[PDB]
Amino acid sequence: YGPNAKSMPTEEGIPPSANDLLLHVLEGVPPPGSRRLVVSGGDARAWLSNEKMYVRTNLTILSPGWLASMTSADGTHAYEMQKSPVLLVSWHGKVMQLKVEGL
Amino acid sequence: KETALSVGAQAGLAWRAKIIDEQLNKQARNLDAIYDFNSLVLEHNILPPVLLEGRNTLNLADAQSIRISDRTYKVAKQAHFITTPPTWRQYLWMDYVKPEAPNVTLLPKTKAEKEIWCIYTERGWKNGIDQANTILEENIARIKEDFGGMILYRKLLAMNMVSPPYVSHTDLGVTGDGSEIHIDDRVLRITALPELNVNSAEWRAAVAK
Amino acid sequence: MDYVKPEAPNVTLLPKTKAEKEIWCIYTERGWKNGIDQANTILEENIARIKEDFGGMILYRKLLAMNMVSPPYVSHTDLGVTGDGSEIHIDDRVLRITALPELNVNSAEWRAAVAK
Amino acid sequence: AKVEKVITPPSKDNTLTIPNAYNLQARASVDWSGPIEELTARIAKAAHFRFRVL
Amino acid sequence: MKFKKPPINNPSDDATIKLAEAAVSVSDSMLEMAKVEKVITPPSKDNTLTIPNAYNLQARASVDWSGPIEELTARIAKAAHFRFRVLGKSPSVPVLISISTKDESLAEILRDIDYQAGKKASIHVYPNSQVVELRYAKIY
Amino acid sequence: KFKKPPINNPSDDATIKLAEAAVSVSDSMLEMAKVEKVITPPSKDNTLTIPNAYNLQARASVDWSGPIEELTARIAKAAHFRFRVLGKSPSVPVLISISTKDESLAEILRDIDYQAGKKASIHVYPNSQVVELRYAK
Amino acid sequence: VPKLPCRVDGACDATIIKMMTDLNKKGIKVASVGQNYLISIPASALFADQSPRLNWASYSLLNEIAAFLKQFRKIAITVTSYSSKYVSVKRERALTLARSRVVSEYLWSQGVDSRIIFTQGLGSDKPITSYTLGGDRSPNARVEITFRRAV
Amino acid sequence: DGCCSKMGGINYCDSSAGRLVCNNGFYSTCYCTRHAVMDLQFLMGCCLWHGGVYPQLNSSGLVVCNDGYVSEECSLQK
């Protein structure tokens, strides 16, 4: 390699599979260094570590768009998400909103 | 206001944790009956590790870039030794002191400050109770995570997805000088940590009835 | 629409006689009308925006039926098992789209429609 | 959606139907994600059927 | 003209509630694991040919024990009027036995002890000479 | 005229589910351990039975932790039996350890053979009053 | 907490108890056991003689049913109709189907809070009383609604 | 206020359910924790369905959500 030594990435490679913190999120263990949040309106829990939300429920969020979704072996959905004041959830064929406090 | 809020939070946290510890001690035998670690230990007093599994994974990096998979597995903590089995006391028991002396700084002298002192201490008490409940939820999550990991490892060992830990022993006879002696010297090492296998064809399915 | 009620009207000046009280009343009323019209203007700008986006996507569906737009192309590549003995993924697939939908310039292959 | 939907009539769709063998009617439970030969061999072994691959 | 439902009992606590709601899921997973392991591993034999039940062994017992093994076996043999015997050597880390049951046989209790022991210790019975034999593993 | 309910009784909705979960877990683990453990019939049990000759019915207190041949030779010497050995001692000696107060030499020999494991065995002859130490290879 | 909700809107168990007392003393059968709830109505106070038509006074009772059904949170309501043997099979089937459809569509148009309404009629195949002396005055010709309370 | 009124009274709460337990076995209409099903459709706040309020301190009246969107309704008149 010379002075410039630009090793050119002609092929980028595989995009990342999943952030592995979602497993402990799925089991309810918060990631280290994170902090607790306040969720009201339903049954869910949430965490904030690196300006990125993690949320845990068994319901289905609709509105704000998520980035990674993990499913347990029995019907529990955990989401790696952006931060939001509020989420839109279809619970049982009916649409509700769940607000989030802690931002 | 805020002083009452602080001392109410402290008193509620302490008292709620006290009642929680009393109930936890009252329900005693079924606890460790449920969490029998000492059944789970392998042949050479070695703790089987913790495994995490996932279903139906997907990531989006950006436009025209996603990646999907069906199942994932991951070792969390490596298998190692245990001179003694663990228990739940390090997972569920919590600390308790008795705060006792809030000094005379903001004592309520009139009716309005008396009643707001009462209700503000009351709501701080509720808040501390809620915080203790959150703490218990986190502990429950931790112990469930660890126990699920070891039972999942036993499952995959039955399924032939993991190599068993490989041990080794070296035996020595007499040892030491003419002043210090040991009778027989047996050395126990573990030469292969357990890990997944990637060869598909060795994997055995199971069928119930 | 974002709504937070403000409950702090900061007070600098006060009327003294009936004339300034009356002009205070009528100017507050005029401001009330102005704020109402501001809210309506914000509403109609928003409704134009959503109408624009919806018209755009239904236009794309229409023109793809018209056969003037190339539909987007995506490969998916499958892999077997992956990862070492530390952690594993069972069957990976990666989907990449390469053809962004463009507009043709070759007018011969254009399709018309007729009705009844 | 009525225009866009593609169907196939069930006269000639390619899917194995129920062979209604009596020993094939038992109940079980399974969980598997991987190869196909091991699972099919285990299923036939539970069914007391001989199993082969072309 | 009042209205009720049947189960009207004393109040509970949310912490106990969450404890039980964890425990049911753990029990489900353990049941699944046990079913899978049973149907994949064919059992072969039984410990009853090793441990037959003889007379003066049907006096019953109800127990609650969470400690070591050897003196507990000595106590139950002393209740049996049987001579007790140990072979091999006890290891450095002691064997831990936790048994919580009620009102069954000495023979079934001993079989439960042997099954809880598993890969480390074993119990044998000599009825012609009324001998309770404990034998450790040949390892370490 | 008075019969109490049990003191530690699960008279609560959380407690009954917790107790049912407990007994379920216990039964499942019992099944798991029972199907996991191996056994062996006494027909092929590899333990030397009791020779029960009258010269071996003495009682003694024994403290030893060391090699094997001198110990069993002294056992035979106190038992007034001749002792011989077929085989050869390897470089690493065979080690044993017994400390006890009151039993007979027959079960002492039984514990000797059980502690020896695969490397050695013993044989008793009361017709010709001898013990044999058989090494492995 | 002055802003956050304290209870469900328009819900009061005292009103629930009072109106179920009034319903059962009116003779419309109100049944509650476990987490399922049944309301059964004789057809004689609702329709004409084996005929799909609605008495004008019956709408007060119908609105009472609506006021009860607003007090609960549910998913699905099933309304079933049964009648007595009159001519055939098919006539009884059609009569039950029409009666159930009419009462279901009126309840949907009124302010009930549901997601799913199932409606069906079975003619006369499921009697609850062998005393078949009377005509429509016998209580087996009836209309029932069942639902399970949601959390 | 009265949750199990015209019943025996309040017994306890099920936080897994979010409803109180009356003396009869009937689930009351009150709530006993925030972790319960709330039919929610209208709420306060601003920068909703956006990145929330950007936490910078502004001398001007520019209130801008974290996605770059600027909400003059949340802001003030000039």
> Are the beta carbons of A53 and A46 closer than 8 angstroms?
yes
| Phi/psi of residue G83, nearest 5 degrees | -140, -170
What are the chain B neighbours of E64 within 8 Å (beta carbons)? 29
CA dihedral B108→B111→B114→B119, nearest 10 degrees, is: -160
CA B175 to chain centre: 42
Element housing C98 (H / E): strand C92-99
What is the least distance, in Å, from the CA of F22 to any CA of chain B?
A: 5
> Residue E35 is encoded by which pair of tokens?
């079913």
What are the chain B neighbours of E100 within 8 Å (beta carbons)? 29, 33
D33 and C CB contact within 8 Å: yes
Q: Which of B74, B73, B72, B70 is nearest to B56 (CA)?
A: B70
CA F5 to chain centre: 46
Q: Do E33 and B155 touch (CB under 8 A)?
A: yes
Q: Which of B144, B151, B52 is nearest to A23 (CA)?
A: B52
> Residue F73 is encoded by which pair of tokens?
């030779």
d(CA B170, CA E24): 45
Helix, coil or strand: residue A30: coil
Count H helices and E strands in chain E, helices first: 3, 5
Helix, coil or strand: residue C87: strand
CA angle H33, H36, H41 (to 5 degrees): 120
What are the chain A neighbours of B59 within 8 Å (beta carbons)? 15-18, 67-68
Contact between chain F and chain B (3 or more Cβ pairs less than 8 Å apart): yes
Q: Which of G125, G55, G27 is nearest to G84 (CA)?
A: G125
| Contact partners, residue B101, CB within 8 Å, separation at least 6 | none
E115 and F CB contact within 8 Å: yes
What are the chain E neighbours of B143 within 8 Å (beta carbons)? 22
d(CA E3, CA E1): 7
> Residue H40 is encoded by which pair of tokens?
């929610």
Q: Do G17 and E3 touch (CB under 8 A)?
A: yes
> Are the beta carbons of H66 and H52 closer than 8 angstroms?
yes
Helix, coil or strand: residue G111: coil
What are the chain C neighbours of D34 within 8 Å (beta carbons)? 90
What are the chain B neighbours of D39 within 8 Å (beta carbons)? 205
Helix pair angle (E14-40, B2-26), 10° resolution: 40
Nearest Cα residue in chain F from E135: F114
| Phi/psi of residue F65, nearest 5 degrees | -150, 95
What are the chain B neighbours of F38 within 8 Å (beta carbons)? none
> Residue G80 is encoded by which pair of tokens?
């079933």
Q: Which of D29, D45, D48 to mutate to test the interface with B (most CBs of B within 10 A)?
A: D29
Measured CA distances, F44 to D42, E50, E117, F48, F49 (Å)? 34, 11, 22, 11, 12
| Phi/psi of residue F79, nearest 5 degrees | -90, 0
How does strand E131-136 pair with strand E83-87?
Answer: parallel
Three-state SS annotation for chain B:
CHHHHHHHHHHHHHHHHHHHHHHHHHCCHHHHHHCCCCCCCCCCCEECCCEEEEEEEEEEEECCEEEEEEEEEEECCCCEECCCCCCCHHHHCCCCCCCCCCCCCCCCCCHHHHHHHHHHHHHHHHHHHHHHHHHHHHHHHHHHHHHHHHHHHHHHHHHCCECCCEEEEEEECCECCCCCCECCEEEEEEEECCCECCCHHHCCCCCCC
d(CA B185, CA B199): 39
| Contact partners, residue B156, CB within 8 Å, separation at least 6 | B51, B73, B162
Distance from first CA to last CA of chain A, Å, rounded?
48
Neighbours of F35 (CB within 10 A): 16
F32 and B CB contact within 8 Å: yes
Cβ-in-10-Å burial (0-12, 13-18, 19+) of F76 comes to buried
Query: What is the 8-class DSSP label of residue D22?
Result: G
C97 and A CB contact within 8 Å: no
Number of cross-chain residue pairs from B and D with Cβ atoms under 8 Å apart: 33
Question: What is chain E's length?
Answer: 140
Measured CA distances, B122 to B10, B12, B128, H32 (Å)? 11, 9, 10, 17
CA angle B143, B145, B148 (to 5 degrees): 105
> Are the beta carbons of B71 and B54 closer than 8 angstroms?
yes
What are the chain A neighbours of B140 within 8 Å (beta carbons)? 28
Indicate the resolution in Å: 4.6
d(CA A49, CA H3): 39
CA angle D23, D25, D28 (to 5 degrees): 105
What are the chain G neighbours of A92 within 8 Å (beta carbons)? 75, 115, 150
Q: Which residue has the tokens 């292969």?
A: B192
Nearest Cα residue in chain B from D28: B209
Q: Do B173 and F19 touch (CB under 8 A)?
A: no
CA G140 to chain centre: 14
Q: Which of E29, A13, B54 is nearest to C87 (CA)?
A: B54
What are the chain C neighbours of H48 within 8 Å (beta carbons)? 2
The conformational region for residue B64 under phi > 0 = left, psi -120 to 50 = alpha, else beta, is left
Nearest Cα residue in chain E from F27: E31
Distance from first CA to last CA of chain E, Å, rounded?
74
Give the type of residue at C14.
L
Among B70, B205, B209, whose Cβ lies nearest the Cβ of D26? B209
> Are the beta carbons of G96 and G123 closer than 8 angstroms?
yes
Among E13, E37, E98, whose Cβ lies nearest the Cβ of B23? E13
Helix, coil or strand: residue H12: strand
What is the least distance, in Å, from the CA of H51 to any CA of chain G?
A: 24
> Are the beta carbons of G100 and G80 closer than 8 angstroms?
yes
Nearest Cα residue in chain C from D34: C90
d(CA A61, CA A54): 13
Helix pair angle (E70-80, E106-117), 10° resolution: 160
> Residue B24 is encoded by which pair of tokens?
């936890």
> Are the beta carbons of A48 and A37 closer than 8 angstroms?
yes
d(CA C25, CA B3): 45
Neighbours of H48 (CB within 10 A): 19
Q: CB under 8 Å, gap of 24 or more: what pairs does F64-67 form? A: F64/F96, F64/F97, F64/F98, F64/F99, F65/B183, F65/F95, F65/F96, F65/F97, F65/F98, F65/F99, F66/B183, F66/F95, F66/F96, F66/F97, F67/F93, F67/F94, F67/F95, F67/F96
H41 and A CB contact within 8 Å: yes
CA dihedral B34→B36→B37→B39, nearest 10 degrees, is: -140
d(CA F29, CA E123): 19
Furthest-apart CA atoms within chain G: distance in Å? 63
> Residue G55 is encoded by which pair of tokens?
């008495």
Give the type of residue at E83.
R
Contact between chain F and chain G (3 or more Cβ pairs less than 8 Å apart): no
> Are the beta carbons of A41 and A97 closer than 8 angstroms?
yes
CA dihedral C84→C90→C93→C94, nearest 10 degrees, is: -40
> Residue G77 is encoded by which pair of tokens?
């309501």
Q: Do B200 and D28 touch (CB under 8 A)?
A: no
B102 and A CB contact within 8 Å: no
Q: Which of F30, F93, F99 is nearest to F64 (CA)?
A: F99
d(CA H46, CA H62): 13
> Residue A33 is encoded by which pair of tokens?
């260094």
User: If interface means Cβ-Cβ distance under 8 Å, which residues of chain H face chain C?
Assistant: 44-48, 71-74, 77
User: Subunits with at least 3 CB pairs below 8 A relative to chain B?
Assistant: A, C, D, E, F
Which of residues 93 through 112 in chain C touch D, CB cutoff 8 A? Answer: none
d(CA E119, CA E135): 11
Q: Do H12 and E8 touch (CB under 8 A)?
A: no
Element housing A77 (H / E): strand A77-81
> Residue C43 is encoded by which pair of tokens?
């509403």
| Contact partners, residue F21, CB within 8 Å, separation at least 6 | B30, B34, E20, E23, E24, E26, E27
Element housing G147 (H / E): strand G142-148
C62 and A CB contact within 8 Å: no
Element housing C26 (H / E): helix C18-66
DSSP code per residue over chain F: ---PPPTT---SHHHHHHHHHHHHHHHHHHHHHHHH-----GGG--S------GGG--EEEEEEEE-SHHHHHHHHHHTT-EEEEES---SSPP-EEEEEEEEEHHHHHHHHHHHHGGGEEEEEETTTTEEEEEE--
| Phi/psi of residue C28, nearest 5 degrees | -65, -40
Query: What is the 8-class DSSP label of residue A14?
Result: P
What are the chain A neighbours of C94 within 8 Å (beta carbons)? 14-15
Q: Which of A51, C88, A1 is nearest to D33 (CA)?
A: C88
Q: Do H15 and E21 touch (CB under 8 A)?
A: no
Nearest Cα residue in chain G from E6: G34
What are the chain H neighbours of C3 within 8 Å (beta carbons)? 44, 46, 73
d(CA E16, CA B25): 11
What is the least distance, in Å, from the CA of B154 to any CA of chain F?
A: 11
Q: Which residue has the tokens 């015209």?
A: H6
Q: Which of B188, B186, B146, B161 is nearest to B43 (CA)?
A: B188
The conformational region for residue E81 under phi > 0 = left, psi -120 to 50 = alpha, else beta, is left
| Contact partners, residue H49, CB within 8 Å, separation at least 6 | A63, A64, A86
User: Subunits with at least 3 CB pairs below 8 A relative to chain H?
Assistant: A, C, E, G
Among F15, F21, F97, whose Cβ lies nearest the Cβ of B34? F21
Give the type of residue at B131.
Q
How does strand F120-125 pair with strand A66-71?
Answer: unpaired
Among A17, A28, A30, whose Cβ lies nearest the Cβ of B57? A17
> Are the beta carbons of A7 and A1 closer than 8 angstroms?
yes
**E31-47 as b/e: b if 16+ CB within 10 A:** ebbbbbbbebeeeeeeb
Measured CA distances, B84 to B45, B150, F37 (Å)? 8, 16, 22
Number of cross-chain residue pairs from A and H with Cβ atoms under 8 Å apart: 44
Q: CB under 8 Å, gap of 24 or more: what pairs does D12-21 form? A: none
CA B99 to chain centre: 29
D34 and C CB contact within 8 Å: yes
Q: Do H34 and A99 touch (CB under 8 A)?
A: no
> Are the beta carbons of E136 and E120 closer than 8 angstroms?
yes
Query: What is the 8-class DSSP label of residue A22?
Result: H
Q: Do F117 and E135 touch (CB under 8 A)?
A: no
DSSP code per residue over G29-54: EEEEETTEEEEEEEGGGTSBTTB---
Among C87, C93, C96, whose Cβ lies nearest the Cβ of B73? C87
Q: Do H16 and E21 touch (CB under 8 A)?
A: yes
User: Where do runs of H (alpha helix) occur along E13-121?
Assistant: 14-40, 70-80, 106-117
What is the least distance, in Å, from the CA of A47 to any CA of chain G?
A: 23
Q: Which of A34, F90, E4 is nearest to G17 (CA)?
A: E4
CA B23 to chain centre: 20
d(CA C111, CA D30): 53
User: Subunits with at least 3 CB pairs below 8 A relative to chain G?
Assistant: A, E, H
Tell me the CB-side half-sphere exposure of residue E2, using CA atoms within 13 A. Answer: 9
Q: Do E31 and F30 touch (CB under 8 A)?
A: no
Q: Do D38 and B207 touch (CB under 8 A)?
A: no
